[PDB]
DNA sequence: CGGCCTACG
DNA sequence: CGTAG
DNA sequence: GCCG
């Protein structure tokens, strides 16, 4: 078992589930806590149970696995023992942890926030709808949409999203191409958000285009919210249901055709592989990635790439394709 | 012990 | 501060 | 919380 989540195939679906999630709980419970090194090892250790070929059964198997010390080997024990971990099933009854993932959950709260109404006394969405003079135009958005955002997008209803935004697209940029990313690329089925990833194969092209593209959308009455030069677009998008529409979160990026890797490899994930791989790519091999580039600090270069495949080879690891990618 | 990804809105 | 993966 |  390699230390680094980038070194693995991770599969979407695997033989630990409930070890990893239990673990997963821990890791969420430290981030509302700001320590952000336990919410990093705790979801490496899961991360870890998901790359296994076959289930954990006994506490030996986890001898010499990375990121498994005193704390998560304790967590898999009393799972394997009793079925359930006391300080996971405190963490889940605890007020602090369920009004924090409540808040946290909202589009336009983050932690700090979060913790602050925590502190004020507030604990349900219908607290924080009543001191609206308190909420951004961003958290009132994501507070009146939140119930729709809470309900997960089926794989239809992004093909039926990727055909509306390829035609605002293609009148804003023709020639313009559209890439779904994110978690349904790595093949989930459903999922909280779409997001997609748009370029020109004329190197320039792409420039001003986001704006172009969000107008039409706006023109087409599909934008429900959304934040407005700029390359990343947080919206709110009408979906079509039945007689009806749901409001879904929609993420729209635009790279210029050089970048285009780094940003698909970055879009896509998970979120886990993707801090592995930065952590990797500077600590292992000296070279800076993001999602514009990989930039040697020495000689004071960008890689140049053309496809993922480049820079899994540039960066000296066995190439994983996006289903591979669920760290 | 230091480090823990790295950006844009 | 929020957002992204 | 764990690695190096
Ligand atoms: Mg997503
Ligand atoms: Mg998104
Ligand atoms: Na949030």
């Given at each position: 078992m390699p230390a680094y989540a980038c070194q693995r195939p991770t599969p979407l679906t695997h033989h630990?589930?409930?070890?990893?999630?239990?673990?997963?709980?821990?890791?969420?419970?430290?981030?509302?806590?700001?320590s952000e090194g336990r919410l990093l090892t705790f979801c490496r250790a899961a991360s870890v149970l998901k790359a296994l070929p076959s289930p954990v059964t006994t506490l030996s198997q986890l001898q010499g696995l990375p990121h498994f010390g005193e704390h998560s080997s304790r967590v898999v024990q009393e799972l394997l023992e009793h079925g359930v971990c006391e300080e996971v099933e405190r963490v889940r009854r605890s007020e602090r942890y369920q009004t924090m993932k409540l808040?946290?959950?909202?589009?336009?709260?983050?932690?700090?926030?979060?913790?602050?109404?925590?502190?004020?006394?507030?604990?349900?969405l219908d607290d924080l709808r009543e001191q609206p003079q308190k909420l951004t135009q961003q958290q009132k958005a994501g507070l009146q949409h939140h119930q729709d955002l809470s309900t997960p997008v089926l794989r239809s209803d992004?093909?039926?999203?990727?055909?509306?935004?390829?035609?605002?697209?293609g009148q804003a940029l023709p020639g313009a191409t559209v890439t779904l990313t994110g978690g349904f690329r790595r093949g989930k089925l459903q999922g909280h958000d779409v997001d997609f990833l748009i370029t020109h194969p004329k190197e320039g092209q792409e420039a001003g285009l986001l704006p172009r593209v969000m107008c039409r959308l706006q023109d087409q009455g599909?934008?429900?919210?959304?934040?407005?030069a700029f390359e990343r677009?947080?919206?709110?998008?009408?979906?079509?249901?039945?007689?009806?529409?749901?409001?879904?979160?929609?993420?729209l990026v635009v790279a210029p055709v050089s970048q285009f890797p780094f940003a698909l490899l970055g879009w896509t994930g998970s979120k886990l592989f993707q801090r592995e791989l930065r952590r990797f790519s500077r600590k292992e091999k000296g070279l800076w990635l993001n999602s514009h580039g990989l930039f040697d600090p020495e000689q004071k270069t960008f890689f140049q790439a053309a496809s993922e495949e480049d820079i899994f080879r540039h960066l000296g690891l066995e190439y994983l394709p996006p289903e591979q990618r669920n760290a």
């Open positions: 630990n589930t409930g070890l990893s999630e239990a673990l997963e709980i821990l890791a969420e419970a430290a981030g509302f806590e700001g808040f946290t959950q909202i589009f336009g709260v983050g932690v700090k926030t979060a913790d602050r109404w925590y502190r004020e006394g507030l604990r349900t992004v093909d039926a999203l990727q055909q509306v935004v390829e035609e605002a697209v599909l934008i429900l919210y959304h934040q407005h677009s947080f919206c709110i998008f009408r979906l079509p249901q039945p007689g009806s529409w749901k409001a879904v979160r929609v993420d």
